[PDB]
Amino acid sequence: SQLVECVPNFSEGNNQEVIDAISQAISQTPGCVLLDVDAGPSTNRTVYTFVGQPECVVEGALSAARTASQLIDMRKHKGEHPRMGALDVCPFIPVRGVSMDECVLCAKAFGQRLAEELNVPVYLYGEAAQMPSRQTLPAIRAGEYEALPEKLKQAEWVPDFGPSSFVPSWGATVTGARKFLIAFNINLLSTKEQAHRIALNLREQGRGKDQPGRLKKVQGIGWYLEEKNLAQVSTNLLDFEVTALHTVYEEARREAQELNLPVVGSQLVGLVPLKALLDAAAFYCDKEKLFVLEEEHRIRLVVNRLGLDSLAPFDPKERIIEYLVPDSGPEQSLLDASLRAFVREVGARSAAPGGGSVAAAVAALGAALASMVGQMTYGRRQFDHLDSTMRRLIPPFHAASAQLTSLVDADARAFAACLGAIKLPKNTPEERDRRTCALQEGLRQAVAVPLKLAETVSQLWPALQELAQCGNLSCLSDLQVAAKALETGVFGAYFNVLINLKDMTDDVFKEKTRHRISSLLQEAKTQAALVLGSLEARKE
Amino acid sequence: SQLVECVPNFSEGNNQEVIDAISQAISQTPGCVLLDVDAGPSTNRTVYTFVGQPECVVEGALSAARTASQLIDMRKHKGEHPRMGALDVCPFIPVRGVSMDECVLCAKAFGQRLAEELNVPVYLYGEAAQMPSRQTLPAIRAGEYEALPEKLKQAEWVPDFGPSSFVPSWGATVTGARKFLIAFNINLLSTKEQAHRIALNLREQGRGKDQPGRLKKVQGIGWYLEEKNLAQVSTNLLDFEVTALHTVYEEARREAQELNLPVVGSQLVGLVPLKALLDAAAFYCDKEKLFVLEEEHRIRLVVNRLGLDSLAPFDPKERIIEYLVPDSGPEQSLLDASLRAFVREVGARSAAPGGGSVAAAVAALGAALASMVGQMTYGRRQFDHLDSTMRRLIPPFHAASAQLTSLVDADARAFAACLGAIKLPKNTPEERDRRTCALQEGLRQAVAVPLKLAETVSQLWPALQELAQCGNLSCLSDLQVAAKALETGVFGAYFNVLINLKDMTDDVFKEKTRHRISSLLQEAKTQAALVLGSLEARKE
Amino acid sequence: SQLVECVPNFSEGNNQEVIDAISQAISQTPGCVLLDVDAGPSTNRTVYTFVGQPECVVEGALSAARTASQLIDMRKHKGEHPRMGALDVCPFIPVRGVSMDECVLCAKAFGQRLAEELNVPVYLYGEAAQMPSRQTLPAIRAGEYEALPEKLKQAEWVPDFGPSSFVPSWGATVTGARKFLIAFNINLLSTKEQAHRIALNLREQGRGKDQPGRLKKVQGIGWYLEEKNLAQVSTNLLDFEVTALHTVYEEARREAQELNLPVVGSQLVGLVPLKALLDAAAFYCDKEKLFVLEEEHRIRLVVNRLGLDSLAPFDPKERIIEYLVPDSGPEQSLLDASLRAFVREVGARSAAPGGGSVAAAVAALGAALASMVGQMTYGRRQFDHLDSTMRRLIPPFHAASAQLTSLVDADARAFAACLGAIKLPKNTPEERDRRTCALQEGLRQAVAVPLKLAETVSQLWPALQELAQCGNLSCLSDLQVAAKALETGVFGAYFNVLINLKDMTDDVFKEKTRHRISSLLQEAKTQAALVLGSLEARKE
């Protein structure tokens, strides 16, 4: 969790010893993970891609520059790509959790610590650069390599970081932060000229100046795969939030049905963020009017809808960032060791798993049961008259189910942080009144999870209630347990909040939480009942 | 589960091709597992050991005889051990679950099907043989190989199975069933003469006839390890239930402290049944007045107390039968897939895990919590005044905990058998009224598990109650959840019984179970309360 | 050319030595090519697939039976698939050129020569069997293996070939001929119950008896891929000519949009005939209103439209029969050796390539030019007002072009057959008057090709004429050459017909052909003119 992508643009030099050496120092930096090293001989550069935590990535960022520092002379460099330094652009993008404003500050970090530890001209670009002339990267590339022999000495071209000095084997470097960018191609069975037409009509810059295309923040052109004999509308989604991965496709689609040319799927080039193609998914269900519950299957759909496997197969387990580098943290979850392990664990001399945890798991067992009857009352003809209802309510349970299963973690994290506080020196005014202060912020979390666990289970009630009305019938049992399990879930949640609020100071927060919690318990108590009622009175 | 050991005594011609060939045909028999093949060159025989289900082992038993049939000529056999056939004794012993009487019937099976499929003289011995002259194996071995040239033709020596015929390359064979036998040696730092004295005094036959030794059903002698310069009281426990593994040791111990000779531990030779050394364990706690909760640790004790690792280390994971071949069954347990797996499973379109199962797990989470507070109130000085009580009640919870964890299985088994019935032809009188009949016996089990799940949780109540009185206090929360969890456990249990009793015919059984169940639910309802009461009124 | 598929159903004893041995004897038969050997352990059979000429395949068919004859004992065979013999069904299907009626006669051949060379009961089935009870294969499989112990001795079950005898290691065999069958699955993101609903609605047998499904000659069911968590409408196209590969897909498509379930592509299982998916292609252009000229590209479309690469990629170069085994013949074509080779070849002391051949090539150069200007006037905006016309005429040229390129072969074949006749003994009445007779049938062909070459070029005239009207203009030159080239093409064609008709006897055929040819030459002469006229008068 807290993922930032970082794509250093390395001026290849062209020769293993340089590449794999940079590509190690970056991969022997703790806290980031090396995701791909694209090298291109005729372009004579190597793009490296790696993700990780805010400060961790910056290490790898500059851990990689100090290894290329003593490995590339730009004097003997000349690639067929408008390079500039030995590290041209080195941008820092969000993936999950981290917002622009952070990525802008990572750029501030790398930029400083770099020009310092080397002595080189560096200007920050994009969502970084303050001077409103530098956000465009190609503008800074002021005619590449041979520029600094005049340009790092102009009141105009003053670097945002780093002296004004010129180094023989270096050529300036540019940090920054942009939005995540996706490479998308659209397969036309047409001709390069036509394909390029279509593209001019989609892309935002449009045919020249005045008269943009249709999609905003989509840039691209017409292209032709040589070996496949296949034309391409090759594009860059500059922001998958503004213009989506499907609204490109679905649009080029129209574009082409206006000129009677078949579109034969697409390809994503490089790595993609989960959301990009997960919104896409939701789009085709919203509009095709469907019900695709399990996430994997939503990826399966949003492939096939865009024919993403047309030029090669699309291994999502290897193409998606959030899957390439999952968000674990330190030490493994109990979530991952066998049921037997979990049970015969809480009951260890474990102060560790327990109470607040079995609360969560009993509750997640709870939801999942309701989820399952939902599905047990689904598909199979006969229940048809309820498909509309089953579709409405199977989800909240299923999604809440997993969410509570995840509170098992939350709980363990909370505790360990509470423990970290407790184990904290003491005594002298500077760290007694500050040790105390963090312990309170400890409990804070400790409290907040059970509280969530309640809040969350407390929403399922009405849908549980309705599911209990119809909803197979041969799962009567399963619903009764379900009702009862979610109930004790909230009981657990309740207790666990109280016992913590005990060591809480901040009566407002307290008194308020105290009361919120109990109502929820109360609601649980009553709600659980009628469910059980309904069921009983159902017994027909 | 249902383990039978089977130790064919093979007249090893002495030569790989014979051994490893038998030892495969036995190991390529489905339903048994090959545990060890002991071969002795100067004895010129090979003892094979393998376990498994009643009928499964018999296959391997006779699957191994038909491969040695066409691989050993007794004409060129002559070992320094009183052999007789190519397969001397082939006995069948219980390990767990299967009783003597069954092992006596396996002997009946192998004996028949063998002399039939070969044409050879076979007499059943031991707990088998009916003629009260044949229970002793050495009596039948009527002077080994050269005997049948006169003895398989005597109204006296008539074989219990098989013609009376003589085969050149075979020499009769003897099936049977005995009790499980352990090889036990006792290490004396003495002399072979002395060691053998000690032994005559323990062993049941004693010094000659009249005047037996002390231990019943222990036979053995004085012996001397050459390379270690170490004497040995070498014994055979003929029945670890009558005279125990420790009562031998602890006795030789006295025996030697009567003659001022040190005893320096012991060794088990071959394989041992879990109970043998698990009772032993319980002995040293009973008498040493201790509290050793976890099973492994009990093995660790009953090692060290008998110095079982003195001649080599004792790998219990590899010496104990019940560990060598665990009692799984068909397909794996859910008990073994991650907590996430279990949750995100019951809530699958699974008719399969669910209801009755989450009942069990919520209940096992329940017990384990109470167990944990017990231990959380144990050890650490301060709680001293409660050590006596903690020791008294931590167990029942802990042992019940695991027992309910195991009902997860039970449940899944029940269901699958119920399903097996349902999926059963139908229609013609022979199999409608008999399909029906098994389905009822189906539900029977389906009912019996939740019912157990209640019964079992219903015993913990009073100890829970008392643990709730004292019992740390900083686990207040943990006990409250615990109380609540066991409660809903019984709720689940309750419902699940009812819904099955619905399709039950047999109103007596019904009406009775109906009522038993509800009382227990009731008891759960009230009992759970005061626990919660006590705890609340404890809040000091 | 002349392709027949042959799928022997072998009762796989299960063990390499059996499989790969059959699979060689079949692949060491000259005139057939081994296309795939599917083996299934739990089914315990191996389906072999191979293609080739009518009589050639039959060799392999029976060349494979005589090797399995002495390699499989049905006595130790027992698979989980309703087998019968060691070679269950051995059917013979058309692929290209060969008609049913031939495939029915191949079945007549294998059936006879087999039961003869072995002595076994064989009945022909399907489009073969005369008795209207045997066309259904499962009916003959009269309860598999244990049947002949009573059934090969019933006035009823009299074999259509082979005695009535029973062999221990064989179990009867069934030849026949059916239509080509495709395995097609439709990927539903639904549930197995639903998927199977959809399927009952498509398949011809429908929900039970009375009330068939929608598609005729499509049989299939509901199915579920375990590892992918993905349901499937699994079908068999029993005749891709009656119900097409797309009309299945496009129908399941509606079927599912009636129940709001997404369909996520499909998979073809095994091998497919080119036409099946080539008609499909033409369908999506007919209805999507497009222009997809080049064949490969048409496969690319009809992939993507059915998402045929969704479960794995679809390598048409390796999935399509007509591509797996192309239709070459004896010795290579000149079509395949470099332009230099061809030129510096006709002009060898070659009686061989020449005249009639350079006729064909000059003509194919002709068409291809006109084709190219068509495309040179296509795509690129500006020529928009002509897209409709360009689409109408680019093809006939392009398709005729390749067709004439293929007359290069024709010509060479003709000649070689003419030569084969000439080189034919002579002299005695039996073979002078019969040698003569074949030589005439020689010239016949020799004539027919140039004649085709004329006829074919003679159709392009009016489209050439119209293409000459508009049609770029910067290719003026290219059209002029084109006109001129097609002209001399017909000249060549003309001469070559005459010179052969010289040795022709059959004045009717002659006089008629003489005249037809000349008119065409004439037409060529005049037509070529105005084309050239138009072009000249175009010069603006």
CATH of the domain at B291: 3.30.70.670
| Catalytic residue status for C81 | yes
β-strand pairing of C125-126 with C174-177: parallel
Calpha distance B446→B377 (Å, rounded)? 38
Token representation of residue A34: 């090396």
C386 DSSP 8-state letter = G
Q: Is C333 part of a structural domain of the chain?
A: no
On whether both A242 and A366 belong to a single domain, the answer is no
Q: Which of A265, A294, A297 sits opposite C304 (nearest CB)?
A: A265
On whether both A231 and A163 belong to a single domain, the answer is no
Helix, strand, or coil here: A162?
coil
Token representation of residue A178: 């942009």
Calpha distance A197→A218 (Å, rounded)? 15
How many Å from the N-terminal Cα to the C-terminal Cα in chain C?
50
Token representation of residue C271: 């091998």
Token representation of residue B432: 């409608």
C495 DSSP 8-state letter = H
Q: Is the alpha carbon torsion for C513, C519, C520, C521 positive or negative?
A: positive
A94 is in an annotated binding site: no
- Final residue belonging to a domain, choices B147, B180, B213: B180
Mutation to test the B interface, candidates A328, A447, A478, A500, most B Cβ within 10 Å: A478
Task: Specify whether the CB–CB gap between A110 and A90 falls below 8 A.
Answer: yes
Closest CA to B232 of B271, B264, B273: B264
Q: Is B349 on the interface with A (CB under 8 A)?
A: yes
Backbone angles phi, psi at B219, to 5 degrees: -120, 150
- Final residue belonging to a domain, choices B325, B350, B377: B325
Calpha distance B331→C511 (Å, rounded)? 85
Calpha distance B288→B291 (Å, rounded)? 9
Closest CA to B357 of B483, B487, B499, B453: B453
Q: Which of A307, A313, A378 sits opposite C304 (nearest CB)?
A: A307
Token representation of residue A145: 């390599």
Task: Give chain C's domain count.
Answer: 3
C220 DSSP 8-state letter = E
Calpha distance A501→A446 (Å, rounded)? 9
Calpha distance A69→A87 (Å, rounded)? 9
Decide if A189 and C300 are in contact by the 8 Å CB cutoff.
yes
Calpha distance A491→B499 (Å, rounded)? 26
Calpha distance B212→B198 (Å, rounded)? 13
Owning domain of residue A372? 338-540
Q: Is B332 part of a structural domain of the chain?
A: no
Task: Specify whether the CB–CB gap between A367 and A401 falls below 8 A.
Answer: yes
Task: Specify whether the CB–CB gap between B155 and B60 falls below 8 A.
Answer: no
Helix, strand, or coil here: C13?
coil
Token representation of residue B337: 């897939």
Q: Which of residues 172-201 of C touch A (CB under 8 A)?
A: 187, 189-194, 197
Helix, strand, or coil here: B26?
coil
Q: Is A309 on the interface with C (CB under 8 A)?
A: yes
CB burial of B438-456 (b: ≥16 within 10 Å; e: otherwise) equals bbeebbbbbbbbbbbbbeb
Q: Is A16 part of a structural domain of the chain?
A: yes
Calpha distance A138→A451 (Å, rounded)? 51
**DSSP alpha helices (H): ranges in A289-338?**
295-304, 316-319, 321-324
Torsion of CA A219, A224, A225, A227, to 10 degrees: -170
Token representation of residue A46: 């190597």
Residue A35, min C-alpha distance to chain C (Å): 25
Task: Specify whether the CB–CB gap between C61 and C108 falls below 8 A.
Answer: no
Mutation to test the A interface, candidates B394, B488, B497, most A Cβ within 10 Å: B488
A162 is in an annotated binding site: yes
Task: Report, in this order, helix, strand and coil percent for chain B, each rounded to 5.
Answer: 50, 15, 35
A320 DSSP 8-state letter = B
Q: Is C286 part of a structural domain of the chain?
A: yes
Token representation of residue A347: 């009951």
Helix, strand, or coil here: B95?
strand
Calpha distance A303→A402 (Å, rounded)? 24
β-strand pairing of C9-10 with C45-52: antiparallel
Task: Specify whether the CB–CB gap between B70 and B17 falls below 8 A.
Answer: no
On whether both A251 and A126 belong to a single domain, the answer is no
Task: Specify whether the CB–CB gap between C276 and C182 falls below 8 A.
Answer: yes
Residue A280, min C-alpha distance to chain B (Å): 25
The tokens 């592509």 sit on which residue?
A: C265
Closest CA to A320 of A372, A264, A274, A366: A274
Task: Specify whether the CB–CB gap between A77 and A84 falls below 8 A.
Answer: no
On whether both B116 and B153 belong to a single domain, the answer is yes
On whether both C82 and C203 belong to a single domain, the answer is no
Calpha distance A345→B338 (Å, rounded)? 13
Which residues on neighbouring strands pair with residue A268, listed in sequence order?
A184
Helices (H) and strands (E) counted in chain C, each on its own, are 18, 11
On whether both A471 and A527 belong to a single domain, the answer is yes
Residue B535, min C-alpha distance to chain A (Å): 11
CB burial of B388-411 (b: ≥16 within 10 Å; e: otherwise) equals ebbeebbbbbbebbbbbbebbbbb
Task: Specify whether the CB–CB gap between A27 and A99 falls below 8 A.
Answer: no
CATH of the domain at B81: 3.30.990.10
β-strand pairing of C174-177 with C89-96: parallel
Q: How many CB atoms lie under 10 A from the CB of residue A361?
A: 31
The tokens 């005139």 sit on which residue?
A: C31
Distances (CA, A) of C117 to A408, C162, C251: 73, 10, 48
CATH of the domain at B388: 1.20.120.680
DSSP of C280-336: HHHHHHHHHT----SHHHHHHHHHHTT--SSSS---HHHHBHHHHS----SS--GGG
**Cα of B252 vs its chain's centroid, Å:** 27
Q: Is C380 on the interface with A (CB under 8 A)?
A: yes
On whether both A302 and A399 belong to a single domain, the answer is no
Q: Is C330 part of a structural domain of the chain?
A: no
Those residues whose C-beta lies under 8 Å from the C-beta of residue C436, and which sit 6 or more positions away, are none
CB burial of C316-347 (b: ≥16 within 10 Å; e: otherwise) equals beebbbbeebeeeeeeeebeeeeeeebeebbe
Q: Is B469 part of a structural domain of the chain?
A: yes
A98 DSSP 8-state letter = -
Task: Specify whether the CB–CB gap between A343 and A300 falls below 8 A.
Answer: no
Decide if C290 and A197 are in contact by the 8 Å CB cutoff.
no
Say which amino acid occupies A42: S
Torsion region of B385: left, alpha or beta (phi above 0 gives left; psi -120 to 50 gives alpha): alpha
Calpha distance A394→A373 (Å, rounded)? 8
Identify the active-site residue in A38, A81, A160, A507. A81
Decide if B492 and A498 are in contact by the 8 Å CB cutoff.
no
Q: Which of A346, A365, A405 sits opposite B368 (nearest CB)?
A: A346
Method for structure elucidation: X-ray
Calpha distance A90→B538 (Å, rounded)? 62
On whether both B353 and B376 belong to a single domain, the answer is yes
**Cα of C20 vs its chain's centroid, Å:** 28
| Catalytic residue status for A411 | yes
- Final residue belonging to a domain, choices B180, B213, B245: B180
C167 is in an annotated binding site: yes
Decide if B481 and A359 are in contact by the 8 Å CB cutoff.
yes
Q: Is C122 part of a structural domain of the chain?
A: yes
Q: Which of residues 238-267 of C touch A (CB under 8 A)?
A: 257, 260-262, 264-265
On whether both B416 and B537 belong to a single domain, the answer is yes
DSSP of A122-161: B--EETS-SSTTSSSHHHHSTTSSTTHHHHTT-SSS--SB
On whether both A151 and A173 belong to a single domain, the answer is yes
Helices (H) and strands (E) counted in chain B, each on its own, are 18, 11
Say which amino acid occupies C445: Q
Task: Specify whether the CB–CB gap between A493 and A457 falls below 8 A.
Answer: yes
On whether both A318 and A232 belong to a single domain, the answer is yes
Which residues on neighbouring strands pair with residue C177, listed in sequence order?
C126
Mutation to test the B interface, candidates A336, A376, A484, A531, most B Cβ within 10 Å: A484
**DSSP alpha helices (H): ranges in C131-273?**
137-140, 148-151, 192-202, 245-257
Edge-to-edge strand ranges of the sheet holding B263-269: B218-225, B230-237, B182-188, B263-269
Closest CA to C453 of C485, C482, C492: C492
Calpha distance C65→C117 (Å, rounded)? 10
Token representation of residue C345: 């070849």
Q: Is C309 on the interface with A (CB under 8 A)?
A: yes
Task: Specify whether the CB–CB gap between A159 and A122 falls below 8 A.
Answer: yes
Q: Is C33 part of a structural domain of the chain?
A: yes
Three-state secondary structure of C76-144: HCCCCCCCCCCECEEEEEEEECCCHHHHHHHHHHHHHHHHHHHCCCECCEECCCCCCCCCCHHHHCCCC
Token representation of residue B494: 């309750």
Taking one residue from A and the other from B, the number of pairs with CB-CB distance under 8 angstroms is 193
Calpha distance A114→B241 (Å, rounded)? 78
On whether both C189 and C141 belong to a single domain, the answer is no
Calpha distance C229→C191 (Å, rounded)? 9
Helix, strand, or coil here: A166?
coil
Torsion region of C355: left, alpha or beta (phi above 0 gives left; psi -120 to 50 gives alpha): left
C11 DSSP 8-state letter = -
Calpha distance A241→A215 (Å, rounded)? 12
